[PDB]
Amino acid sequence: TATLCLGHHSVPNGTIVKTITDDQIEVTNATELVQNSSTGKICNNPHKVLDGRDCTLIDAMLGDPHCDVFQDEKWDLFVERSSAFSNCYPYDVPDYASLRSLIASSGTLDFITESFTWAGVSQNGGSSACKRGPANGFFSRLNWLTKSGSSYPLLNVTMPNNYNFDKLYIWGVHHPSTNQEQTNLYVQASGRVTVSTRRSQQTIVPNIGSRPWVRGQSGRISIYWTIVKPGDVLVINSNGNLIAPRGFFKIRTGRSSIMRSDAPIETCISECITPNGSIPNDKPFQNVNKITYGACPKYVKQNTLKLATGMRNVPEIAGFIENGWEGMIDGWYGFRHQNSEGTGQAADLKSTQAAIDQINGKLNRVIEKTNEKFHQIEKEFSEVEGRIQDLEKYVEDTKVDLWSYNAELLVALENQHTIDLTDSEMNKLFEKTRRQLRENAEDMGNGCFKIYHKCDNACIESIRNGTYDHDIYRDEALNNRF
Amino acid sequence: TATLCLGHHSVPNGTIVKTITDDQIEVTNATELVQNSSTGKICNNPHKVLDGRDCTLIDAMLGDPHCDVFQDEKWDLFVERSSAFSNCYPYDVPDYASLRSLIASSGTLDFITESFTWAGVSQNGGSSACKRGPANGFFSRLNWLTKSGSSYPLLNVTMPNNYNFDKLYIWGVHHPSTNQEQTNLYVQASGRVTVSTRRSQQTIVPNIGSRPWVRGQSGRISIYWTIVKPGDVLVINSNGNLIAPRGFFKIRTGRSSIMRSDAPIETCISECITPNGSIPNDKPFQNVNKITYGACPKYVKQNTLKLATGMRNVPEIAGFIENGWEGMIDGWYGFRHQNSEGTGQAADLKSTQAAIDQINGKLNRVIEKTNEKFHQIEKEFSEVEGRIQDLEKYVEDTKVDLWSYNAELLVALENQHTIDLTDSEMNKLFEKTRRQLRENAEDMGNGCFKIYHKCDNACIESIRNGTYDHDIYRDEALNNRF
Amino acid sequence: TATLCLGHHSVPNGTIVKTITDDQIEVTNATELVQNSSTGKICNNPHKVLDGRDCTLIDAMLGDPHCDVFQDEKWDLFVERSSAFSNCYPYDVPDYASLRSLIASSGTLDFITESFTWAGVSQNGGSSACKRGPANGFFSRLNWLTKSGSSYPLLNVTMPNNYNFDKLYIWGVHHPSTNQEQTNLYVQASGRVTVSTRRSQQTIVPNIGSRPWVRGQSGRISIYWTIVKPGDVLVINSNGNLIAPRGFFKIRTGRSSIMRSDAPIETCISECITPNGSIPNDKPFQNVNKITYGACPKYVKQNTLKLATGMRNVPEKAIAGFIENGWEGMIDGWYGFRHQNSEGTGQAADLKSTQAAIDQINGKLNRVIEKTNEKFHQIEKEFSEVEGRIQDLEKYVEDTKVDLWSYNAELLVALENQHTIDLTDSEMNKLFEKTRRQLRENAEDMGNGCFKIYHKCDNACIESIRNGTYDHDIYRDEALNNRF
Ligand SMILES: *[C@@H]1O[C@H](CO)[C@@H](O[C@@H]2O[C@H](CO)[C@@H](O[C@@H]3O[C@H](CO[C@H]4O[C@H](CO)[C@@H](O)[C@H](O)[C@@H]4O)[C@@H](O)[C@H](O[C@H]4O[C@H](CO)[C@@H](O)[C@H](O)[C@@H]4O)[C@@H]3O)[C@H](O)[C@H]2NC(C)=O)[C@H](O)[C@H]1NC(C)=O
Ligand SMILES: *[C@@H]1O[C@H](CO)[C@@H](O[C@@H]2O[C@H](CO)[C@@H](O[C@@H]3O[C@H](CO[C@H]4O[C@H](CO)[C@@H](O)[C@H](O)[C@@H]4O)[C@@H](O)[C@H](O[C@H]4O[C@H](CO)[C@@H](O)[C@H](O)[C@@H]4O)[C@@H]3O)[C@H](O)[C@H]2NC(C)=O)[C@H](O)[C@H]1NC(C)=O
Ligand SMILES: *[C@@H]1O[C@H](CO)[C@@H](O[C@@H]2O[C@H](CO)[C@@H](O[C@@H]3O[C@H](CO[C@H]4O[C@H](CO)[C@@H](O)[C@H](O)[C@@H]4O)[C@@H](O)[C@H](O[C@H]4O[C@H](CO)[C@@H](O)[C@H](O)[C@@H]4O)[C@@H]3O)[C@H](O)[C@H]2NC(C)=O)[C@H](O)[C@H]1NC(C)=O
Ligand SMILES: CC(=O)N[C@H]1[C@H]([C@H](O)[C@H](O)CO)O[C@@](O[C@@H]2[C@@H](O)[C@H](O)O[C@H](CO)[C@@H]2O)(C(=O)O)C[C@@H]1O
Ligand SMILES: CC(=O)N[C@H]1[C@H]([C@H](O)[C@H](O)CO)O[C@@](O[C@@H]2[C@@H](O)[C@H](O)O[C@H](CO)[C@@H]2O)(C(=O)O)C[C@@H]1O
Ligand SMILES: CC(=O)N[C@H]1[C@H]([C@H](O)[C@H](O)CO)O[C@@](O[C@@H]2[C@@H](O)[C@H](O)O[C@H](CO)[C@@H]2O)(C(=O)O)C[C@@H]1O
Ligand SMILES: *[C@@H]1O[C@H](CO)[C@@H](O[C@@H]2O[C@H](CO)[C@@H](O)[C@H](O)[C@H]2NC(C)=O)[C@H](O)[C@H]1NC(C)=O
Ligand SMILES: *[C@@H]1O[C@H](CO)[C@@H](O[C@@H]2O[C@H](CO)[C@@H](O)[C@H](O)[C@H]2NC(C)=O)[C@H](O)[C@H]1NC(C)=O
Ligand SMILES: *[C@@H]1O[C@H](CO)[C@@H](O[C@@H]2O[C@H](CO)[C@@H](O)[C@H](O)[C@H]2NC(C)=O)[C@H](O)[C@H]1NC(C)=O
Ligand SMILES: *[C@@H]1O[C@H](CO)[C@@H](O)[C@H](O)[C@H]1NC(C)=O
Ligand SMILES: *[C@@H]1O[C@H](CO)[C@@H](O)[C@H](O)[C@H]1NC(C)=O
Ligand SMILES: *[C@@H]1O[C@H](CO)[C@@H](O)[C@H](O)[C@H]1NC(C)=O
């Protein structure tokens, strides 16, 4: 007689995962699917990262003197720091967020000076709240007009767009603190500013009243913008309180954006940037921050998700029935034989290769490699606003919940199918071996066959290869069994 | 000889479910996953529910006399009734929804009086449209200023924030019906109101014109609000038409919200509130209302979803092949034996336990227990508005469709796997029994084994336990079978 | 002895699909789930499609002369062309998109004229920028008021809503180019327009200043609207610069909408319309356009998704069984028997297992996904100008929805293919095991899916085995001598 047993490998330290059917099952190998940490640094490649330091994007656009270093800059990602401050004439922007988003998306601050003529007024007004060295100054891209002599005439100027790209104009209106100041700077008791194209118009009447002192001044300035398409024309008509433009900004379509962060910038390479720093993108999910730029993993709420990579781990001649082989390091499935010569062991390459090829590349079949997103909505707020902020928060929360559910279900399903396939492979190998031994062998019921004839080492090798001929040993076996 | 059959339990009345593969299959037990009814009452525990009977939140905030009972109230959920009405001076709020949302989210009406000084004007103006008993009155939190003698001087007042929390100020502007009324109440022919901090400013010019009578009055009032951060200062500068504040409201961050409902409030306990009433949250899905507050099931479009909790139900010695055992009430899987002593029956505990432990707790592996949401967007509207309302409706519709698809797919998948696992358990038990009987038994092909030796009750019990020794009965069987 | 083999059909040209476990597996039949093409025409049935031609919806509402043919029209879908233009007095609409969406959703332009009284002013002002034939004209639904003699008195007019439906009023304000023009047309140096109900009010002060010439004019007009509920009243109070309404529009609730397209309209039937044209809706997914109207498939990013309809396709390499071998010579069913005997070889098919497999395969996708979701009026999804916050939010919402539905479609196809392959394999194995059960001890398995029967099993014996009425005892003893 002889013994031929079939078995599968096991490891001393396994990992616990979750399936559709079982909450905890131990397997021989697993991988983590959620990225949960960052180095805390922002890499300067391959995206062009521009550090704003102590300047906001709007202050750099307007021409705050301590931001003069930012003239005509370009970026892929503009990083705004929390220590930024303003040091010029106090101002406000109706719909600040929209202008900020527009400028950030455009990705450039290229400015072209134009030859405006302002007949009968003084130009280049200044203030002690915006100092350029020792002298009083103002925003570098704006022109503060006041009366000349004792008159402030009606201004009526035009500028056509004879290029083939769009023009962006930034202009403003001054709000004085008293009626006496209004008459002192602009002769008329009530100013008016009108800015129009062939398809749009805006008219502003200034507001008068005392306000809290900011850098010594109780007056204010309001900022507005206008876009002029190719073939159109801009007309400015005003009888007081005009803060004139000095030229226009180019506006482009691209993949630029802006981000708030305090992380330092270092020399390295990374495709995914968050406010916490750069993160690697080899995993499909991340838990670091829902604000991202570049090729990034999808944000989820879970901090860990384990995907099974090997078969179930069963502690440890016998077969595979509730028994694993801790002494096998040559493969996943294999044979053992007990004989007159002695015990021997070998592995099955075909079933191991089939299992590995099935397991490898599993998650790429369902989920995409990397989703690249560049400019998105704001997801953190500093002031309370109401309806629109509520809607933005609701949208983000809904998206996060749905993607977290997707990730959980996908991991559970994949683990279930991996376990099932490994078990089926083992059973198929056992059944094929049973098919080869037609009537000369019997199943012991523990995954092990007993062969009734003399099966030496060459006999076992013939069985393992698949060239076993039962007829040769048929009659003898029929004598041993009955 | 003897007969040993394997079988599974059956029930007289089963339930229909749907799987991935079959449109309808009958099982022995199932559970409903969608909650589709409410008692029609709102429970007063554990959330603090405040009923605004005849008052809206805005009217209670401003100080409508018939809302005077609501001064300095707090809530977790404010319930607005459809029979609420206004009984004071006619008014309107630019961006009513935003102020309503922010007050509701704050969750309190705590008001602190401040000592404003208004020099040269008369205070506490009233109207017959807002009666406090027999006398003419006004909103309790606002101060109506008019001329004193024959003059209305320029008002210029300031108030600093020396606390460590934010302040909310409510103020207003009066719109008269005629120019004569304008000059009669405020000496100047055109009023103006300016309210500012160091970081913001608002200026309002009143509108003059006749309007439809409301409680005898053709004039109107417009309401505005301002938030003052710690370390900032509020400045009010007015030439006329000012409705002054009397103090400030505390504004907080929390989980409070507001709801429109007509359901009565009763003494009970429930964690999930809808406009239809309170609902239990033991099920993962609900169909009652997409407006919810608290720990609630997810809203879906389906009114019923059945999850299988038992094996397939097959109508009814024989085995398990296309035959169930209605006479088995001691377990799920079991043995029957036919012998010289007589027929006998028993149940298998291990396979039953494995099946039950697999079935129990299946849905908790994929879906979360309860998602708590407190303040969300509005989902029902009474007027047509356009762009923003279209966006809100679109967002809600997208969310509902995606979650309904998720629920349908999850139920189908879980039912498929439950059926598969029960079938596999039965087959495994049969194969194990076949393994134990090595050569002394024959498979009848109906799920039954024919034993060709004398197998008495003790022999049956040895087979069932797993201690059956074939060698003892080997030779005799070989004589009987051949 | 005799031979009995079990096998399954195969085809000379199979199709590749993807499952959860395999990147590529070849099956005998598959179907495409994504619609990726259109005929380029919009069908005029069953929806009512109205071609705007050279007019926008707002211009047709206001009464632009070259749009006069659109008076009192109705639609289910309004189609705006890219060659539309305006040919009247220059104007602008604050919140243009909201008014456009409201009118498009209402679905009608039914107008009722009312008898307003404007005492002390002249009516029916016109311009050379808006010509009706040879004469100067104006919008047909608006009345341009102007001074009479040397005075422009204060106007207070009222109109009550005594019906049981809502009223929509469109009105406007004129912005002159100079102060002299302001005093010439309206005596007062600063005009004012107030429009109010019991629950709302709006007041407009006109703006003065020079603007670029549009059809000879530097002045402008601004357009506003007001809704009056049943039992309410409208009051108009003005002392200059008013563009008065002539009546009211009916406003309805329904499923009407508007779409931008240049596709021509033809006589045909189709339930789903896109800017590219009509598309059939027999498939659950589409890749043509994310803008749709009617009963339409869900938009996804993938251009193809193949769902398996048959079993795995195995080529055909002494008859053999189903083990790594298919039967190209079988055209009568999916699973079948073959027998080798003294009379000769014979073949037959199994009807029960084939029927079970087909009934499982048929109608699988309808169990999970709904047939058709009908959507009528939605948000805008393409923009011509940069705006900022709201446009960013709309684009973000649409992108999120598209990504989630694409993931759903991919996962569903993979899961369904996996289960189809599993069910076909299980059916074949079950048939083989049943056949093994019938031959209790009278036959031996060769291990290639084929049994060999030790006794004399003729054609009638084969048929008895196939039917399920084979009795082993009859041939028991004889086989027990052949085997041992
Ligand atoms: C309408 O109401 C507003 C608000 O109340 C008034 O605005 C105030 O106007 C006064 C006068 O212009 C302002 O007073 C000035 O404040 C400056 C800043 O003060 C800060 O810094 C100093 C020292 O750094 C601190 O001590 C102080 O507490 C503040 O923290 C001062 O620097 C100015 O000093 C000038 O006057 C002093 C007088 O002794 C001279 O010695 C100095 O050399 C210098 O000339 C000055 O005191 C006040 O800040 C404004 N308030 C606000 C909130 O901005 C309007 O004036 C009022 N309008 C009318 C018509 O009444
Ligand atoms: C600008 O245009 C508007 C719109 O027409 C005009 O506003 C109207 O002004 C008049 C005069 O002030 C208002 O008339 C008053 O209406 C009150 C409410 O009437 C309702 O209730 C009564 C009884 O409950 C009903 O019979 C009636 O049909 C209404 O349902 C009346 O109570 C007032 O009564 C006073 O006058 C009568 C006259 O006999 C006396 O007997 C009374 O004691 C009392 O003194 C009064 O009739 C009218 O309501 C306003 N209309 C609207 C829509 O509000 C402006 O006049 C106009 N501007 C100018 C400058 O002309
Ligand atoms: C404030 O600033 C604005 C902006 O500059 C000024 O607006 C301009 O006003 C002038 C005067 O009315 C306008 O001039 C007129 O332009 C018409 C259109 O010109 C177009 O078409 C012609 C031929 O088709 C082209 O050659 C031309 O380049 C344009 O493409 C002309 O048709 C008018 O012609 C009149 O004058 C000629 C003079 O020879 C006569 O022969 C004609 O019969 C006719 O009477 C006229 O030239 C100009 O278009 C306005 N510009 C814009 C951009 O709108 C304001 O005038 C200014 N306000 C003040 C107070 O200064
Ligand atoms: C262009 C111009 O007029 N610049 C002035 C400026 C403005 O007049 C003012 O900011 C408009 O609100 O004001 C400057 O300052 C003045 C002080 O020097 C003076 O003591 O008080 C004035 C207020 O009553 C005013 O603040 C400034 O901003 O530096 C002077 C500058 O030339
Ligand atoms: C604080 C004050 O002036 N209160 C007045 C009030 C206002 O003057 C008015 O609401 C401003 O629009 O008006 C009161 O009523 C008046 C009537 O008594 C009078 O017959 O007609 C007036 C209109 O021309 C006005 O309606 C009121 O609202 O009760 C009187 C109150 O003292
Ligand atoms: C109802 C009316 O007053 N219609 C005028 C119209 C308006 O006065 C004007 O559009 C208001 O801005 O203007 C018309 O044209 C005028 C020219 O004929 C004239 O040479 O120059 C005027 C400007 O100073 C004005 O453009 C028009 O629009 O056709 C004449 C019409 O009767
Ligand atoms: C990445 O940075 C964010 C900053 O927003 C961290 O999130 C905050 O974490 C603190 C500490 O737990 C909380 O108090 C805040 O409420 C969090 N903010 C938000 C918006 O969630 C986050 O923990 C950081 N992640 C890593 C891995 O460093
Ligand atoms: C819960 O209350 C809502 C009220 O919004 C009910 O929904 C309405 O039901 C009526 C009657 O079928 C319809 O005419 C309305 O169109 C429904 N409104 C909406 C917004 O869908 C709902 O039926 C109630 N549910 C239960 C279980 O009582
Ligand atoms: C249906 O029409 C849309 C029009 O938007 C086509 O999408 C455009 O295709 C062109 C050509 O590749 C691109 O340059 C544009 O960027 C696309 N626009 C958008 C918004 O995606 C689309 O290809 C058409 N589909 C069919 C099947 O004809
Ligand atoms: C576990 O699987 C990963 C593949 O994801 C492989 O890189 C790793 O070497 C495996 N671990 C062991 C111990 O084989
Ligand atoms: C059906 O299953 C539920 C558990 O989901 C259990 O409470 C109930 O008793 C079962 N019904 C029967 C008849 O066993
Ligand atoms: C493939 O399946 C479709 C239905 O899914 C059927 O119409 C078609 O005839 C099938 N092809 C063949 C060759 O049977």
mmCIF file of N, CA and C in Angstrom, chain A residues 18 20-21 92 175 207-212 220 384-385 387 390 394 397-398 401-402 405 408 442-443 445 452 481-482, chain B residues 98 101 156 192 194 196 201 203 227 235 237 358 365-366 373 379 385 392 396 399 403 406 410 435 438-439 474 478 482:
data_model
loop_
_atom_site.group_PDB
_atom_site.id
_atom_site.type_symbol
_atom_site.label_atom_id
_atom_site.label_comp_id
_atom_site.label_asym_id
_atom_site.label_seq_id
_atom_site.Cartn_x
_atom_site.Cartn_y
_atom_site.Cartn_z
ATOM 1 N N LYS A 18 -12.752 40.889 6.789
ATOM 2 C CA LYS A 18 -14.200 40.756 6.847
ATOM 3 C C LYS A 18 -14.753 40.452 5.461
ATOM 4 N N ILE A 20 -18.619 39.115 3.207
ATOM 5 C CA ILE A 20 -20.073 39.245 3.209
ATOM 6 C C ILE A 20 -20.695 38.280 4.211
ATOM 7 N N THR A 21 -20.115 37.091 4.347
ATOM 8 C CA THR A 21 -20.675 36.014 5.153
ATOM 9 C C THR A 21 -20.124 35.970 6.573
ATOM 10 N N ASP A 92 -13.562 96.714 0.276
ATOM 11 C CA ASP A 92 -14.383 95.513 0.298
ATOM 12 C C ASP A 92 -14.723 95.119 -1.132
ATOM 13 N N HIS A 175 -16.077 105.607 -1.197
ATOM 14 C CA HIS A 175 -17.123 106.010 -0.265
ATOM 15 C C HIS A 175 -16.532 106.930 0.795
ATOM 16 N N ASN A 207 -21.831 105.667 -1.199
ATOM 17 C CA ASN A 207 -22.458 105.803 0.108
ATOM 18 C C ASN A 207 -21.592 106.665 1.019
ATOM 19 N N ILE A 208 -22.235 107.522 1.807
ATOM 20 C CA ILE A 208 -21.548 108.460 2.689
ATOM 21 C C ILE A 208 -21.882 108.111 4.133
ATOM 22 N N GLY A 209 -20.881 108.152 5.000
ATOM 23 C CA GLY A 209 -21.090 107.901 6.411
ATOM 24 C C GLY A 209 -19.805 107.534 7.115
ATOM 25 N N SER A 210 -19.786 107.797 8.422
ATOM 26 C CA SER A 210 -18.618 107.484 9.236
ATOM 27 C C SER A 210 -18.521 105.987 9.504
ATOM 28 N N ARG A 211 -17.296 105.481 9.501
ATOM 29 C CA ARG A 211 -16.972 104.081 9.716
ATOM 30 C C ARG A 211 -15.803 103.985 10.682
ATOM 31 N N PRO A 212 -15.594 102.822 11.305
ATOM 32 C CA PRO A 212 -14.449 102.678 12.216
ATOM 33 C C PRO A 212 -13.127 102.907 11.498
ATOM 34 N N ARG A 220 -13.954 104.271 2.596
ATOM 35 C CA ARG A 220 -13.796 102.919 2.065
ATOM 36 C C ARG A 220 -13.763 102.949 0.542
ATOM 37 N N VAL A 384 -20.435 82.649 8.819
ATOM 38 C CA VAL A 384 -21.755 82.083 8.567
ATOM 39 C C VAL A 384 -22.449 82.913 7.496
ATOM 40 N N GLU A 385 -23.039 82.242 6.524
ATOM 41 C CA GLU A 385 -23.651 82.927 5.391
ATOM 42 C C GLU A 385 -25.096 82.517 5.149
ATOM 43 N N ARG A 387 -27.820 80.203 3.057
ATOM 44 C CA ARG A 387 -28.401 79.251 2.112
ATOM 45 C C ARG A 387 -27.336 78.556 1.263
ATOM 46 N N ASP A 390 -25.015 76.303 3.219
ATOM 47 C CA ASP A 390 -25.746 75.090 3.568
ATOM 48 C C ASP A 390 -25.772 74.113 2.401
ATOM 49 N N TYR A 394 -24.030 70.404 2.238
ATOM 50 C CA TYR A 394 -24.886 69.247 1.997
ATOM 51 C C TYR A 394 -24.363 68.403 0.840
ATOM 52 N N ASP A 397 -21.197 66.463 1.955
ATOM 53 C CA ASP A 397 -21.533 65.376 2.872
ATOM 54 C C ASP A 397 -22.166 64.196 2.140
ATOM 55 N N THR A 398 -23.088 64.477 1.212
ATOM 56 C CA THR A 398 -23.726 63.410 0.446
ATOM 57 C C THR A 398 -22.693 62.604 -0.336
ATOM 58 N N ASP A 401 -20.570 60.322 2.003
ATOM 59 C CA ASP A 401 -21.296 59.153 2.493
ATOM 60 C C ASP A 401 -21.424 58.080 1.414
ATOM 61 N N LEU A 402 -21.781 58.484 0.191
ATOM 62 C CA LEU A 402 -21.966 57.490 -0.865
ATOM 63 C C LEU A 402 -20.658 56.774 -1.199
ATOM 64 N N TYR A 405 -19.738 54.187 1.524
ATOM 65 C CA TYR A 405 -20.519 52.963 1.364
ATOM 66 C C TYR A 405 -19.964 52.101 0.233
ATOM 67 N N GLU A 408 -16.748 50.231 1.394
ATOM 68 C CA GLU A 408 -17.026 49.126 2.312
ATOM 69 C C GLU A 408 -17.575 47.909 1.566
ATOM 70 N N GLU A 442 -8.502 4.502 -2.451
ATOM 71 C CA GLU A 442 -9.701 4.853 -1.703
ATOM 72 C C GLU A 442 -9.469 6.097 -0.856
ATOM 73 N N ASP A 443 -10.537 6.874 -0.688
ATOM 74 C CA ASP A 443 -10.510 8.098 0.104
ATOM 75 C C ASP A 443 -10.640 7.756 1.585
ATOM 76 N N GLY A 445 -11.224 10.018 3.861
ATOM 77 C CA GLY A 445 -12.144 10.959 4.464
ATOM 78 C C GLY A 445 -11.502 12.149 5.141
ATOM 79 N N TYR A 452 -3.851 0.798 -2.927
ATOM 80 C CA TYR A 452 -3.813 -0.601 -2.521
ATOM 81 C C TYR A 452 -2.651 -1.378 -3.123
ATOM 82 N N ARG A 481 -8.033 -4.810 -2.413
ATOM 83 C CA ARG A 481 -9.219 -4.146 -1.886
ATOM 84 C C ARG A 481 -10.274 -5.138 -1.412
ATOM 85 N N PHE A 482 -10.491 -6.218 -2.153
ATOM 86 C CA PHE A 482 -11.515 -7.189 -1.791
ATOM 87 C C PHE A 482 -10.889 -8.499 -1.325
ATOM 88 N N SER B 98 -32.069 82.861 4.515
ATOM 89 C CA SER B 98 -30.755 82.790 5.151
ATOM 90 C C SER B 98 -30.820 83.168 6.629
ATOM 91 N N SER B 101 -32.555 80.409 8.517
ATOM 92 C CA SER B 101 -31.690 79.248 8.681
ATOM 93 C C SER B 101 -30.643 79.479 9.763
ATOM 94 N N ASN B 156 -24.662 109.359 15.163
ATOM 95 C CA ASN B 156 -23.336 108.758 15.008
ATOM 96 C C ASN B 156 -22.991 108.078 16.332
ATOM 97 N N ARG B 192 -30.960 108.037 5.114
ATOM 98 C CA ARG B 192 -29.845 107.145 4.826
ATOM 99 C C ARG B 192 -29.435 106.446 6.112
ATOM 100 N N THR B 194 -26.341 103.800 7.611
ATOM 101 C CA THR B 194 -25.063 103.132 7.399
ATOM 102 C C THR B 194 -24.664 102.389 8.666
ATOM 103 N N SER B 196 -21.663 99.672 10.081
ATOM 104 C CA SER B 196 -20.356 99.182 9.660
ATOM 105 C C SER B 196 -19.552 98.631 10.830
ATOM 106 N N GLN B 201 -19.501 96.681 5.733
ATOM 107 C CA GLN B 201 -20.312 97.888 5.708
ATOM 108 C C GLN B 201 -21.599 97.617 4.939
ATOM 109 N N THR B 203 -25.071 100.104 3.546
ATOM 110 C CA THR B 203 -25.772 101.380 3.464
ATOM 111 C C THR B 203 -27.091 101.186 2.734
ATOM 112 N N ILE B 227 -23.088 90.899 12.161
ATOM 113 C CA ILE B 227 -22.359 90.104 13.146
ATOM 114 C C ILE B 227 -21.066 90.823 13.505
ATOM 115 N N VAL B 235 -20.470 100.627 14.295
ATOM 116 C CA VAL B 235 -20.772 102.045 14.145
ATOM 117 C C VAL B 235 -22.066 102.183 13.353
ATOM 118 N N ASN B 237 -24.489 105.138 11.683
ATOM 119 C CA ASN B 237 -24.509 106.521 11.224
ATOM 120 C C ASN B 237 -25.762 106.717 10.384
ATOM 121 N N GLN B 358 -23.976 32.266 10.436
ATOM 122 C CA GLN B 358 -23.729 32.979 9.189
ATOM 123 C C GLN B 358 -24.859 33.953 8.878
ATOM 124 N N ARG B 365 -22.668 44.027 8.507
ATOM 125 C CA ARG B 365 -21.308 43.974 7.983
ATOM 126 C C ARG B 365 -21.066 45.031 6.913
ATOM 127 N N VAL B 366 -22.101 45.419 6.177
ATOM 128 C CA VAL B 366 -21.962 46.341 5.054
ATOM 129 C C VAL B 366 -22.476 47.732 5.398
ATOM 130 N N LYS B 373 -28.079 63.147 11.320
ATOM 131 C CA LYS B 373 -28.016 64.424 10.623
ATOM 132 C C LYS B 373 -28.975 65.387 11.302
ATOM 133 N N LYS B 379 -36.333 71.232 1.516
ATOM 134 C CA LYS B 379 -36.707 70.267 0.496
ATOM 135 C C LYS B 379 -38.122 70.459 -0.032
ATOM 136 N N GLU B 385 -38.889 80.360 -7.483
ATOM 137 C CA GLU B 385 -37.746 81.259 -7.362
ATOM 138 C C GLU B 385 -36.785 81.181 -8.539
ATOM 139 N N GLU B 392 -31.325 72.985 -5.680
ATOM 140 C CA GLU B 392 -31.636 72.223 -4.471
ATOM 141 C C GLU B 392 -32.475 70.987 -4.790
ATOM 142 N N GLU B 396 -31.337 66.927 -4.248
ATOM 143 C CA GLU B 396 -32.110 65.958 -3.472
ATOM 144 C C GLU B 396 -32.543 64.771 -4.332
ATOM 145 N N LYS B 399 -29.594 62.361 -4.925
ATOM 146 C CA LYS B 399 -29.299 61.571 -3.733
ATOM 147 C C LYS B 399 -30.301 60.432 -3.563
ATOM 148 N N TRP B 403 -29.412 56.301 -3.625
ATOM 149 C CA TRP B 403 -29.611 55.437 -2.462
ATOM 150 C C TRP B 403 -30.644 54.339 -2.725
ATOM 151 N N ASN B 406 -28.824 51.613 -4.507
ATOM 152 C CA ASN B 406 -27.975 50.893 -3.561
ATOM 153 C C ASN B 406 -28.777 49.866 -2.771
ATOM 154 N N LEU B 410 -28.234 45.767 -2.877
ATOM 155 C CA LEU B 410 -27.776 45.107 -1.661
ATOM 156 C C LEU B 410 -28.703 43.964 -1.272
ATOM 157 N N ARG B 435 -18.429 10.265 3.239
ATOM 158 C CA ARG B 435 -17.044 9.962 3.590
ATOM 159 C C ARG B 435 -16.968 8.947 4.721
ATOM 160 N N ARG B 438 -17.325 4.103 4.163
ATOM 161 C CA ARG B 438 -16.228 3.987 3.206
ATOM 162 C C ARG B 438 -16.590 3.061 2.046
ATOM 163 N N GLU B 439 -16.890 1.792 2.338
ATOM 164 C CA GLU B 439 -17.344 0.860 1.313
ATOM 165 C C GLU B 439 -18.607 0.096 1.683
ATOM 166 N N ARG B 474 -16.823 -4.294 7.829
ATOM 167 C CA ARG B 474 -16.337 -4.275 6.453
ATOM 168 C C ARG B 474 -16.665 -5.576 5.727
ATOM 169 N N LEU B 478 -19.066 -6.475 2.325
ATOM 170 C CA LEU B 478 -18.544 -6.925 1.042
ATOM 171 C C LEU B 478 -19.232 -8.200 0.577
ATOM 172 N N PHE B 482 -21.829 -7.651 -2.967
ATOM 173 C CA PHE B 482 -21.386 -8.379 -4.150
ATOM 174 C C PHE B 482 -21.792 -9.847 -4.078
#
